[PDB]
Amino acid sequence: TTIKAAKKMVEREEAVVWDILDEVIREHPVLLNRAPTLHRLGIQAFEPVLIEGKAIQLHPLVCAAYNADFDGDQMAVHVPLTLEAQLEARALMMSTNNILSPANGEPIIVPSQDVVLGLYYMTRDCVNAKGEGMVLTGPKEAERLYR
């Protein structure tokens, strides 16, 4: 009932406060930012997902967009609190909106590495590999045949 009681409850982290927190951010966006924000993409909007530890996970594609390696580079978070700002982050700076650089009409979401390697390995052709010369009733059949 009282605000000080709620402060105490958060201080103790009762088993209900986590459900409450998970509820209060179900759609509430958030802002992630890199230290040198050279261009417009240096600040983007995401939806947070609760995790453990103290690190800040972020999609690899946008981390190629932030010009952000994983050499220990730090990132700052921000929470848009007014309704206008929440909806603004959801409508303008959400990652699913910035997919082309304002500089060039090229796509900023480029699979950088460790997946181009994966797909490239998945799409090649050994001249004599186990299974060569069959007929497949469809892609799912090939997937089952492989697994």
Binding site: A15, W18, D19, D22, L50, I51, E52, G131, G133, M134, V135, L136, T137, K140, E141, E143, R144, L145, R147
Partner: protein, 222 residues
């Protein structure tokens, strides 16, 4: 406490009535991967069913061929037959005949209506035909086998085809994280599977679970 956690599953999504998506939650730190992988490996290979394995066109006895009357090569016909899911009764092996003439698509429903088999989709197209004066027939033998047995492994005149006994067409498990009030992260399993329609997907999961449990039965206590 030497007592584990049992899931409170949340959804059996039955989109298309032959391609289901089951979720399960929550599972212990690693049990998601082990359960998903065991179920997947059992369902793929070791899950008995029935499917065609012998094809015999009584006019052409070669995979390669120049057989008119049909605008599809014999390879297309073998491919179509590969997916002709037929659920068999107490019989373990039976041959079927498909003598047909006409104009267009020779489809499954033209099979002679035996009493020991049941096609799952009579609306399955098998092979399209030349529109006039074309009556090519063929017999087809099925078998009650274990799983996927390719032709190259069966090759040792009578034509062969890729035996696919496993009723499952595809299956993939994906494990996400799930929360318990203070617990960090427990596996939340999501298995999407797609079968021949000869058995509903959840029924196939049930069958695989039963087969694995009756395999395990030799070691457990309770």
């Amino acid at each position: 406490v030497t007592e584990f956690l049992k899931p409170r599953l949340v959804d059996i999504e039955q989109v298309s009535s032959t391609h289901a998506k089951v979720t399960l939650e929550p599972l212990e730190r690693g049990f998601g991967h082990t359960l998903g992988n065991a179920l997947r490996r059992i369902l793929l290979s070791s899950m008995p069913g029935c499917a065609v394995t012998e094809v015999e066109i009584d006019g052409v006895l070669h995979e390669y061929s120049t057989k008119e009357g049909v605008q599809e090569d014999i390879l297309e016909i073998l491919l179509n037959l590969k997916g002709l899911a037929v659920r068999v009764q107490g019989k373990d092996e039976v041959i079927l005949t498909l003598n047909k003439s006409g104009i267009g698509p020779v489809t499954a429903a033209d099979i002679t209506h035996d009493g020991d088999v049941e096609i799952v989709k009579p609306q399955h197209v098998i092979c399209h035909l030349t529109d006039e004066n074309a009556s090519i027939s063929m017999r087809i033998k099925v078998q009650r086998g274990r799983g996927y047995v390719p032709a190259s492994t069966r090759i040792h005149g009578r034509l062969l085809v890729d035996a696919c006994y496993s009723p499952v067409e595809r299956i993939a498990y994906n494990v996400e994280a799930a929360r318990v009030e203070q617990r960090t992260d427990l596996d939340k399993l999501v298995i999407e599977m797609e079968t021949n329609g000869t058995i509903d997907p959840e029924e196939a999961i049930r069958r695989a679970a039963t087969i694995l449990a009756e395999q395990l039965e030799a070691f457990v206590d309770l």
